[PDB]
């Protein structure tokens, strides 16, 4: 069986005009040969293109690469991870439906689920999905979907994706998994029983900190068709240039992830043994609750994780005196980023949910890049040992 | 009174690193000076950027350009006209609300209002908005929005935006106008009393057929903040490169529109007097119902319009023997496009709505470009002779 | 008209795409050894490697070629790349070049510093007078190189008359028509062998690309130019060619506006008490107007005018609110510069005097803004 | 000392408008504050920009990255490797000067030195530079430059860069080295005594097969200023978009080269032991002449090399029956390329020079990518073992 490195470098499809790199189809529309040919494409008959919102060759090339690593029936690219998330939930959920979602989610996902979904008559509970019994207890006759992020942003809380998938499968609910934090090299939710696997491509998949985009992949042709139908009307599109950039970043995804995984673990171990650090939430550490599940259900770890300092002042002093790490939000970039969730990525999260998420002023999140790991550790060490 | 040509070519804002052209900020994230500075930005305090989904300087420069021409409090750019439409309606409407929309709308707008909105518990009635009395009769206690396209895609049906805005003002509803077909050079819905004006930037605004994008502009600061809050979560973003291309295309928008307008009128009059053509639906023709309203409420016309052949066979002959015009959906490009609405742009609209729209297999939609008109007419004359 | 031709270029669509795709690629795949071998021998149809040929760049080349009436066109990474490729592809040690005495600063640098290092004799002379061209002629003269109207003074050379001299005497005539665009000046139509442009100016028109183009009357000459380019390596990037082709779609319409704005502005300046003299080729007062009127079908909107002192020029250039102080020209928005300390600052003193470039001169490149707004900007800056 | 991976990911310079990724300055011109500020910039006084041909911020960012890895006084980026080679030779050589260049060079370099330089009154000899004594024997009173490619394209012939540099330094000649085949990760000619080190950035540096570009770096400020002065008039520029892409590709250069090097050596060893293969020219093999010089003077190897089949027909059969390798010219891409030098990259090389270079119809050149090496080897093996 051919390695994923090779698969990503050799995607299926004809070359265009013998071009080795796939061209950028910076076009809005496409030409018809005849009234019939154009009519037929609008009915889904024949091969070809109509209009970039319905399908653009460069974006489709990126979709096929993701589809190939997810093992999906199809993938849909979007203008952002939030586009993928809206389109993977609201394409299916309608008034009177019930959604169970993790209680520790990316801030704007909490915003979408707690502000917008209830306005559309959709019932939403945020539940601790690290415990399958709590998921079952929150289940209702109208539950149509469970939505999980695991490991969760930013605390890395692990959910039992396989265990929850069994209950979804028995009860007729879709299981949707945001695998952004781990990448499809290491977490393949469709292999664990999910119906839909999605990512912010803005993070690891693209990897170069220069594109916002999203992708969603479905286990069935019907589900990916419905998602694309929603996309056509909701309009979160990946631009041709951004698709060219995402496909290009993904060409190095397997080797970047290997380096991220190993750097991340080494940085977490360094932090865990350091006297200034109270606790390290990296799901690859034996000390981490849920390490046993992550180890079984994933084939590696991402390199974004959280650690606890002794105070807010210690956290600030660390974050502001680094020379290699960059103070900024986002994650999954080739270079190391660091931020303060309580006052940044999660500052818009309701106090109620903040308290249950376990997010405090002492926490710092680091997204470890592919720099030489000793250089990253020496940067953290000099800031930690400051006068 | 500085002219709009000059305004578009001289947008407000600082140069970046003294660059003459505005740089393409192909970035996802921005760096913070300190914890406090990043925290302040997240609370909307101070000046700066955080992350391109929240705000990208290249995208914002294009937003400022549109905002100036619309006379708006602010503008939001999107990944498509459908992103703008979605974000300008679903940012406000919620379960139990009622929407009144024009009966003649772009096909996917029909799909949005007719398939997705009701799944979200929003009641929707499509009605003939060319008669303000029919809008009044359709009104309900829970009516929160009227949504109009004028002239409508593809029949060019005209609504009294001004009269309808009075009714919305009186009865506590937002008026949203899709002004894609006319461009903001010739139609400024916020000057007519609308609350929101939006475009498929994919059409005239960009004008070069190489970008898909949307823009929406609101009369009030609170409404544009809501639109952008919805955009934050829904995620239809204009890419930095596309914003660079849309701003660049918009630099020639006023001259392109002058030519489109003059060209489309000349073509329509040629077709109207030709023996093979049953009727021509251009809002700038004296024969067109709604001409009197379009002339008073607009300062010009787009060049996309519809005409009727004597049979489907005839329309097919004409569409397939043109050498200059290109058979393709979309409109408002520098070159001439031609389309068959029944089986293309409006193929998916339900039979009953299609009947109400007056769309038949005999209709052909042309989007007249900025070619020498004599070439477009000769191309048409050529084909009609076969 | 020209607009229809530029909007409907010849060629096939790629994958039915309406906009021509951006071939952001270095290399192309071969179907077999034989097919790749054949392409390297110039047999069959297809591509090998973007330096030899890129489809997006070739589409832009074909657009310029059609408008110039050429046998072919070559795109480059800058106007300087087109210039050095249209001259050094032909001239060799022992050859002599006659060049206009007033040229863009970097062309002066090329001809004055580099060409003589390569054993090429160069005389800069006043090409507004054909007898001076004849008098400078030598048995080893192989090329005349003209800019008309010249940058920055707008000095006009008789292209047609010089072409007759060149044809009779076995020399190539190369014309840089940057200042006028191919809508208005078509040197190959006047007898020239090669016509070239800084695409960075009018042709692109949007101030966001640097590029060059050269067009040759003969198939053999464009082959030589591309052969030189293959080894010298000044290429137009596929993204820049996409942008250039895109800007060119509005070229004829922009040029009509530039021309009309520029004339109205020159006329305003010419009757202003603060202005000594306006060098615009379309003015009746300008020496060489009669040639320019006969050999061109319009005018660009870049031209020079004379203030009463350096201090006055500085005051004018530093109080404009619409016009931007920057080098370059032919952009949609109005640009203004000081040739003596900017574009022409490195020109040797003696060539400078021969050019007539003094610290009292300001060069303006009138954009497509409403002319009344640009006149009001100049007006307040001249009077307050 | 900080690792090169870290340096490339953290290049010196201020961020622009706090942007994490460096913006694309798609501009021709820049604005002046005043006539004095503009006048000064033209005199080289003060900080700022004028016009992209003279200096573009995005291009300068990429130049700084190369300069940092070369250990140079400065770097200049170009529209192509050939722009870099032209500008690194013709910026210095004039009529009456003499150039000694290697006899095995990239085809278009042979075209430049053999067709264009003599037209400009520059004397050129192509010499076997793998023998320092032959270089000395070719020396004349007017010799001003030696130009080397090592390992040479496509035979991998190795020159003694250090030994030749001694002779250049004693006699007042510049040494110019095209290090395209090896990359600046493994070959740093300025540390071996070269005055100028240059690359086709089109190959490894960019790495992604989607840009043509060049770069040249000089040991002295004076020489890089002269190179840029030439560039200003000859006009081979790197476009702002291309510079953004080259900088982006270069963020993964160290990890890509590590994999290229390891894959290329394993493929060479596989080929060297295979019955169908007559000889393998990879400078990292102990069997290769000049292996001892390459191993002392480089810190690794590129993964483009040539091998000899038993016949032209055998080469064609191999080249036309691969599923992973792509038949195409160029090299140094993430995916594996293969070509036939005799009829492709070197088909324009004059017969006498071909014979001097040792290029025959039996030779195949492979540029090994970063695919899983076992997939690459299995692809070659199945083609070699065809019916
Ligand atoms: C507060 S601003 C920083 C962005 C960010 N996270 C993003 C993200 C998204 C959304 O993806 P989009 O940004 O729309 O491509 C979806 N799902 C997950 C697990 C995510 O981590 C962060 O820094 O924690
Ligand atoms: C059937 S496919 C051709 C697209 C098309 N029209 C689009 C359009 C949109 C949507 O804008 P987006 O396409 O999302 O940028 C919004 N509003 C109006 C009046 C529109 O006409 C057409 O060819 O009639
Ligand atoms: C001092 S820097 C400003 C650039 C400039 N002129 C350029 C130019 C070129 C060169 O074109 P490239 O810049 O290489 O695309 C060629 N030919 C002509 C008639 C030109 O005017 C100027 O502002 O006068
Ligand atoms: C198709 C190109 C091949 N080579 C190129 C090359 C260049 C020239 O570099 P641009 O191509 O001008 O960037 C310079 N120096 C070296 C050692 C090279 O290999 C090839 O062999 O396959």
DSSP secondary structure string for all residues of D256-313 = HHHHHHHHHHHHHHHHHH-TTEEEEE-TTSTTSTTHHHHHHH-SS--SEEEEEESSHH
Give domain C252-384's CATH number out of 3.40.50.300, 1.10.10.10, 3.65.10.10, 3.90.1150.10. 3.90.1150.10
Asked whether D149 lines ligand 4 (CB < 6 A), one says yes
Active site residue C49: no
Method: X-ray
Q: Give the Cβ contact number of residue A77 at 10 Å.
A: 29
The ligand placed nearest to the CA atom of residue B367 is 2
Give me ligand 3 centre to Cα C157, in Å: 19
- Give the contacts of C149 (CB within 8 A, at least 6 positions apart): C155, C156, C179, C180, C281, C288, C292, C300, C303
Query: Maximum distance among all alpha carbons in chain B?
Result: 74
How far is CA A260 from each of CA A265, C329, C361, D115, rounded to the nearest angstrom? 8, 48, 60, 50
Beta strands across the sheet bearing B337-339? B279-281, B304-308, B363-367, B337-339, B326-327
How far is CA B213 from each of CA A76, A79, A81, B218, B369, rounded to the nearest angstrom? 18, 11, 18, 17, 20
Residue A107: Cβ-neighbour burial (10 angstroms; 0-12, 13-18, 19+): buried
Nearest residue (CA) to ligand 2, atom 22: B330
The β-bridge partners of C278 are: C305
Q: What DSSP designation does B14 have? A: P
Whether residue C21 and residue A18 make contact (CB cut-off 8 A), yes or no, is no
Partner residue facing D27 (CB), from C77, C207, C345: C207
B240-250 and B57-70 helices cross at what angle (nearest 10)?
30
Helix, strand, coil distribution of chain D in percent, nearest 5: 40, 15, 45
Helix, strand, coil distribution of chain C in percent, nearest 5: 40, 15, 45
**Inter-residue contact C48 to C39 (CB < 8 Å):** yes
Kind of pairing between the strands at A123-127 and A98-102: parallel
Residues of D in contact with B50 (CB under 8 A): none
- Give the contacts of A18 (CB within 8 A, at least 6 positions apart): C28, C29, C30, C31, C46, C47
**Inter-residue contact A333 to A207 (CB < 8 Å):** yes
Q: Give the Cβ contact number of residue C384 at 10 Å.
A: 7
Q: Residue B192: CA atoms inside 13 Å, Cβ hemisphere, count? A: 31
- The breaks in chain D (C to N more than 2.5 Å) occur after none
CA–CA separation, D343 and D341 (whole Å): 6
Nearest residue (CA) to ligand 4, atom 3: D330
Closest CA to D90 of C232, B208, C93: C232
Place of tokens 């609750």: A289
Give me ligand 2 centre to Cα B216, in Å: 14
**Inter-residue contact B57 to B29 (CB < 8 Å):** no
**Inter-residue contact C138 to C166 (CB < 8 Å):** no
Q: Give the Cβ contact number of residue A320 at 10 Å.
A: 16
CA–CA separation, D293 and D158 (whole Å): 7
Q: Determine the straight-line distance between the first and last CA of chain A, rounded to whole angstroms.
A: 55
Atom of ligand 4 nearest to the CA of D154: 21
Place of tokens 């470039």: C357
Asked whether B153 lines ligand 2 (CB < 6 A), one says yes
Q: Give the Cβ contact number of residue C297 at 10 Å.
A: 13
**Inter-residue contact D201 to D180 (CB < 8 Å):** no
**Inter-residue contact C97 to C142 (CB < 8 Å):** yes
Q: Give the Cβ contact number of residue C140 at 10 Å.
A: 11
Closest CA to D16 of B30, A286, A367: B30
CA–CA separation, D17 and D9 (whole Å): 19
Active site residue C254: no
DSSP letter string, B242-262: HHHHHHHHHTTHHHHHHHHHH
Atom of ligand 4 nearest to the CA of D346: 21
CA–CA separation, C249 and A304 (whole Å): 48
**Inter-residue contact B126 to B103 (CB < 8 Å):** yes
Q: Which of C17, C36, C54 should be substituted to probe chain A, the one whose Cβ sees the most A Cβ atoms within 10 Å?
A: C17
Closest CA to D332 of D301, D288, D289: D301
Q: Residue D40: CA atoms inside 13 Å, Cβ hemisphere, count? A: 10
Our mutation pick for probing the ligand 3 site, out of C104, C196, C206, C240, counting the most ligand atoms within 8 A of Cβ, is C104
Closest CA to C304 of C364, C226, C360: C364
Partner residue facing B5 (CB), from C4, C206, C369: C369
Query: Maximum distance among all alpha carbons in chain A?
Result: 77
CA C215 to chain centre: 12
Active site residue B256: no
- Give the contacts of D349 (CB within 8 A, at least 6 positions apart): D107, D110, D357, D359
C1-251 placed in CATH 2.40.50.140? no
In degrees and rounded to multiples of 5, residue B242 shows phi and psi of -65, -35
Partner residue facing B208 (CB), from C8, C208, C249: C249
**Inter-residue contact C211 to C199 (CB < 8 Å):** yes
Whether residue B29 and residue A235 make contact (CB cut-off 8 A), yes or no, is no
D87: nearest CA partner in chain C? C232
Q: CA-based angle C172:C175:C179, to the nearest 5?
A: 175
Q: What DSSP designation does D85 have? A: H
CA–CA separation, A310 and A281 (whole Å): 15
Long-range contacts (CB closer than 8 Å, 24 or more residues apart) made by B322-326: B322/B379, B322/B380, B322/B382, B322/B383, B323/B379, B323/B382, B324/B371, B324/B375, B324/B376, B324/B379, B324/C4, B324/C8, B325/B366, B325/B376, B325/B379, B325/B380, B326/A31, B326/C18
- Give the contacts of B92 (CB within 8 A, at least 6 positions apart): B144, B145, B174, B226
CATH tag, D2-253? 3.40.640.10
Partner residue facing B335 (CB), from C8, C257, C367: C8
The helix (run of H) or strand (run of E) holding residue B144 is strand B143-149
CA–CA separation, C18 and C2 (whole Å): 20
Tokens of B238: 């204009």
CA–CA separation, A65 and A78 (whole Å): 14
Set C95, C101, C158, C176: catalytic member: C176
Cis peptide preceding C149, ω within 30 of 0: yes
Give me ligand 2 centre to Cα B105, in Å: 10
Tokens of B75: 């503008």
CA–CA separation, D4 and B219 (whole Å): 53
CA–CA separation, B83 and B73 (whole Å): 20
Asked whether D345 lines ligand 4 (CB < 6 A), one says yes
Give me ligand 4 centre to Cα D22, in Å: 28
Residues of B in contact with A53 (CB under 8 A): 80, 82, 108, 212
Beta strands across the sheet bearing D337-339? D277-281, D304-309, D363-367, D337-339, D326-327
CA B193 to chain centre: 17
CA D65 to chain centre: 16
Q: Which of A9, A11, A17, A54 should be substituted to probe chain C, the one whose Cβ sees the most C Cβ atoms within 10 Å?
A: A17
CA–CA separation, C301 and C333 (whole Å): 11
Kind of pairing between the strands at D363-367 and D304-309: antiparallel
CA–CA separation, D20 and A256 (whole Å): 19
Q: Which of C251, C370, C371 should be substituted to probe chain B, the one whose Cβ sees the most B Cβ atoms within 10 Å?
A: C370
Whether residue B233 and residue A330 make contact (CB cut-off 8 A), yes or no, is no
- Give the contacts of A23 (CB within 8 A, at least 6 positions apart): A16, A17, A57, A58, C14, C21, C22, C23, C24, C25
The ligand placed nearest to the CA atom of residue B201 is 2
Whether residue A375 and residue D252 make contact (CB cut-off 8 A), yes or no, is no
CA–CA separation, B210 and A151 (whole Å): 39
Q: What DSSP designation does B116 have? A: I
**Inter-residue contact D137 to D108 (CB < 8 Å):** no
Beta strands across the sheet bearing C172-176? C72-76, C212-216, C194-198, C172-176, C141-147, C96-100, C121-125
In degrees and rounded to multiples of 5, residue A22 shows phi and psi of -75, 125
CA D127 to chain A, closest CA, distance in angstroms equals 35
User: Buried b vs exposed e over B53-85: b needs ≥16 C-beta within 10 Å?
Assistant: bbbbbbbbbbbebbbbbbebbbbbbbbbbbbbb
Domain boundaries, chain B: 2-253, 254-386
- Give the contacts of D198 (CB within 8 A, at least 6 positions apart): D81, D84, D85, D88, D176, D177, D178, D179, D180, D214, D215, D216, D217
Our mutation pick for probing the ligand 2 site, out of B80, B84, B105, B106, counting the most ligand atoms within 8 A of Cβ, is B106
Set B157, B188, B203, B231: catalytic member: B203
Residues of C in contact with A48 (CB under 8 A): 16
CA–CA separation, C295 and C148 (whole Å): 10
DSSP letter string, C16-54: TBSSPPB---SBB--SSHHHHHHHHTT-SS---BTTT--
Asked whether B163 lines ligand 2 (CB < 6 A), one says no
Closest CA to A53 of A33, A85, A79: A79
Place of tokens 């039915």: C16
Beta strands across the sheet bearing B143-149? B74-78, B214-218, B196-200, B174-178, B143-149, B98-102, B123-127
Our mutation pick for probing the ligand 1 site, out of A77, A106, A189, counting the most ligand atoms within 8 A of Cβ, is A106
CA–CA separation, C198 and C236 (whole Å): 12
Partner residue facing D20 (CB), from B17, B24, B27: B27
B202: nearest CA partner in chain A? A28
A254-387 placed in CATH 3.90.1150.10? yes
Fold of B254-386: 3.90.1150
Place of tokens 């939006």: B198
Whether residue B28 and residue D20 make contact (CB cut-off 8 A), yes or no, is yes
Nearest residue (CA) to ligand 1, atom 11: A81
Q: Give the Cβ contact number of residue A302 at 10 Å.
A: 30
Q: Is C181 left (phi over 0), alpha (psi -120 to 50) or beta?
A: left
The helix (run of H) or strand (run of E) holding residue D111 is helix D107-111
Atom of ligand 1 nearest to the CA of A339: 23
- Give the contacts of C114 (CB within 8 A, at least 6 positions apart): C84, D90, D230, D233, D234
Listed in order, strand segments (DSSP E) in chain C are 72-76, 96-100, 121-125, 141-147, 172-176, 194-198, 212-216, 277-279, 302-306, 324-325, 335-337, 361-365
Tokens of B381: 């004359």
Same CATH fold assignment for domains C1-251 and C252-384: no
Asked whether C210 lines ligand 3 (CB < 6 A), one says yes
Cis peptide preceding D115, ω within 30 of 0: no
Helices and strands, counts by H and E, chain C: 15, 12
Whether residue A31 and residue C24 make contact (CB cut-off 8 A), yes or no, is no
CA–CA separation, B17 and B182 (whole Å): 36
Closest CA to D212 of D183, D246, D250: D246
Kind of pairing between the strands at B143-149 and B98-102: parallel
Q: What DSSP designation does D146 have? A: E
**Inter-residue contact D321 to D379 (CB < 8 Å):** no
CA–CA separation, B179 and B189 (whole Å): 8
Kind of pairing between the strands at C172-176 and B363-367: unpaired
């Amino acid at each position: 069986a051919q390695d994923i490195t090779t698969t990503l470098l050799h995607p299926k499809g004809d070359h265009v005009l013998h071009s080795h790199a796939y061209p950028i189809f910076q076009t809005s529309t496409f030409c018809f040969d005849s009234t019939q040919q154009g009519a037929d494409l609008f009915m889904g008959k024949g091969e070809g293109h109509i209009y970039s919102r319905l399908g653009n060759p460069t974006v489709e090339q990126f979709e096929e690469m993701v589809c190939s690593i997810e093992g999906a029936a199809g993938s849909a690219a979007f203008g952002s991870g939030m586009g993928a998330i809206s389109s993977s939930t609201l394409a299916f959920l309608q008034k009177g439906d019930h959604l169970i979602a993790g209680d520790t989610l990316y801030g704007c996902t909490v915003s979408l689920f707690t502000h917008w979904l209830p306005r559309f008559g959709i019932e939403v509970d945020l539940i601790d999905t690290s415990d399958v019994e709590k998921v079952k207890a929150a289940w209702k006759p109208n539950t149509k979907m469970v939505y999980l992020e695991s490991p969760a942003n930013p605390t890395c809380k692990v959910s039992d994706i396989k265990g929850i998938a069994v209950v979804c499968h028995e009860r007729g609910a879709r299981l949707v998994v945001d695998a952004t934090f781990t990448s499809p090299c290491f977490l393949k939710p469709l292999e664990l029983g999910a119906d839909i696997a999605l990512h912010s491509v803005s993070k690891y998949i693209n990897g170069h900190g220069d594109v916002i985009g999203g992708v969603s992949s479905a286990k069935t042709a019907e589900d990916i068709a419905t998602i694309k139908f929603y996309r056509k009307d909701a309009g979160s599109l990946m631009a041709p240039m951004d698709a060219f950039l995402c496909a290009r970043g993904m060409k190095t995804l397997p080797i970047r992830m290997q380096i991220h995984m190993e750097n991340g673990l080494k940085v977490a171990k360094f932090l865990e043994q350091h006297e200034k650090i109270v606790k390290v939430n990296h799901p690859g550490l034996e000390s981490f609750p849920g390490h046993d599940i992550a180890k079984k259900q994933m084939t590696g770890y991402g390199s974004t994780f959280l650690f606890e300092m002794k105070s807010f002042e210690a956290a600030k002093k660390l974050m502001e005196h680094l020379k290699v790490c960059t103070l900024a939000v986002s994650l999954g970039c080739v270079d190391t980023l660091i931020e303060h969730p309580a006052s940044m990525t999660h500052a818009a999260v309701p106090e109620n949910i903040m308290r249950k998420q376990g997010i405090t002023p002492e926490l710092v999140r680091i997204s470890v890049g592919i720099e030489n790991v000793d250089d990253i550790i020496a940067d953290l060490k000099q800031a930690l040992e400051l006068w």
